[PDB]
Design a binder for these strands. Sequence first.
DNA 1: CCTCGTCGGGGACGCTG
DNA 2: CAGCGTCACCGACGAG
Lengths: 299, 299
Amino acid sequence: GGGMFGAFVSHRLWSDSGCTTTCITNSIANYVAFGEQIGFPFKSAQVFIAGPRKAVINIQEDDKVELLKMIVKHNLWVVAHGTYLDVPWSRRSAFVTHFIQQELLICKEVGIKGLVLHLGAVEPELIVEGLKKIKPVEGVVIYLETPHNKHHTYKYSTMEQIKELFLRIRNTRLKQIGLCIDTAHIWSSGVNISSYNDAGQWLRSLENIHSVIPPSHIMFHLNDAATECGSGIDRHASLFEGMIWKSYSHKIKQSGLYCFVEYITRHQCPAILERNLGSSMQLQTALTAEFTTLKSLLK
Amino acid sequence: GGGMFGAFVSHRLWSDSGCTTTCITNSIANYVAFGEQIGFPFKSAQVFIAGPRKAVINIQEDDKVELLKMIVKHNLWVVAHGTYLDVPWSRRSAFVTHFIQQELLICKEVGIKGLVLHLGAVEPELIVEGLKKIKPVEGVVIYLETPHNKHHTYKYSTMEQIKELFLRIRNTRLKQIGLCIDTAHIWSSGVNISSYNDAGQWLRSLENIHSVIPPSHIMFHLNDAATECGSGIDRHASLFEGMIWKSYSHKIKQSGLYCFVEYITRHQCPAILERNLGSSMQLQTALTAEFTTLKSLLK
DNA sequence: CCTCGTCGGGGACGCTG
DNA sequence: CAGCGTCACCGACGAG
Ligand SMILES: [Zn+2]
Ligand SMILES: [Zn+2]
Ligand SMILES: [Zn+2]
Ligand SMILES: [Zn+2]
Ligand SMILES: [Zn+2]
Ligand SMILES: [Zn+2]
């Protein structure tokens, strides 16, 4: 197999109005159907199992059982984005760490392959401190997502900072820790990835530290951005419709995105499209454009 | 007689170099002599009897006796500008109100006809509340000077606010309260008085509330301004040398200043020229220019 | 139970009448 | 003392 492409599945916008106990499983079912209809069978997906605005578990025991069968039936590589309250490097991180411990156990329970956590603009020593309090579970790897700020030293969007972080992780013998790369986050953090060569040099530098972070522990969030490079604002957009790759609307194979797609296919990485909008028709309209553009890129 | 013109007499820049014995009286003598020399006998004067940077009485009992004889000898109309600490409507409204009682009693002791107090950017009732705490002394009237601010609500530079303020004063029947109009203060407070008619309508509006504030209790600070209209900055300048009446350097009888002089001559008001320069040579140079300009205006 | 950014109001400051 | 300009800080507010 090559790359494993997919999108973020909102419970609201994908679950059938008449679900009762297995709502998350139903949202996946319609999501899988949508891909087969548009001619792009998905191999990956991202969902919420909690929050994301409150540290509360959303899934139900009925949904757990049927979700595992749904994932195995369609051979899906699924991660769960943690709630926005998941910051192990905080003051009262005793509740938070236990809450993440719960999410990790559920992911193993239902066949989800990881949990995405946001990185703070904090020194790497504090990050591993919070990570040290988390006892891991097998089969589930914590993915650390690239943050987005403006006037903070620690951005974790340059390779020098990513290496230094994961070097401390490897020196601490911390198991099952990965990296999630959000193109919009590193772009709103100062890293210009518009042209093929600029994304090339960045990805080449990522490959140069594979001993610290191997591509087996790397996933991608393929997002365009409706903001400026270095602004520090998270405003996702559909591919080639935001300020990163809008200029490459009719030369898509010269864009920094195609260089990312080449990396994803080369290292068989997961790629998630996190874009949310007001309506189901609006979302499936944008998703049809993006995934048909990927279909042409993989043709 | 007509108007009573004069200037502010610093008891340093006018007293004999290194004065010790009766300095305020000596400063007046040279000030009177300076007028006789330049051909402009002064009828008014303004001095400090305290501060203005510290709540301490500067005059001495020796100076008191000779100053009274000096004032009567030349028939001078003298006021004392209060220190910058004189705010009866403040937190320390117990100490300040007693300090003013001291200054007020000294003015009667030496023949000074009033004390100038600055108005705050405060509601008018706090002002009369503070003024009600002051037991008056006869023959001495408290003159309230117009302030200078940009963003505060209360400017006391438009006639609508002056009227309600002094209306509040008359309704409380507290005696011996006057008004001091600083052309530079009301100008840096938003009131353009550059042209003859603009000063005309403002002074005309002052005459319209003569039942509330009679011209017998009105004095003037004739200052140009080295700032912009409405800036909120107190920067005095010589007449026709600042940003108010510089445009009327060779058409002085078409300026708003001449309209003020007409008012002063009409109601026999005192007019004080407050100039802060560097040396005695700098000050007496600027004063000769202004007072000779007034000499031509009164010809 | 988290953080980003922005925006807009509050107080601190070393001036100057 | 009470003005101003300047500006950082705290506290709301939508984000994701
Ligand atoms: Zn995220
Ligand atoms: Zn993301
Ligand atoms: Zn994002
Ligand atoms: Zn004054
Ligand atoms: Zn004045
Ligand atoms: Zn002034």
